């Protein structure tokens, strides 16, 4: 699959420090 393939809201980013900083906002 892609490299962050983030399903918790469902969304891939080839970038960490992207998807990290909407891990903050995971409550
Ligand atoms: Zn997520």
Same mark, same amino acid.
């Given at each position: !699959? !892609? @490299?962050? /393939? *983030? @399903? $918790? *809201? /469902? !969304? %891939? *980013? @080839? +970038? $960490? #420090?992207?998807?990290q #900083?909407?891990?903050? %906002?995971? +409550?």
């Open positions: !699959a !892609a @490299p962050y /393939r *983030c @399903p $918790l *809201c /469902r !969304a %891939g *980013c @080839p +970038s $960490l #420090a992207s998807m #900083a909407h891990m903050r %906002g995971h +409550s």
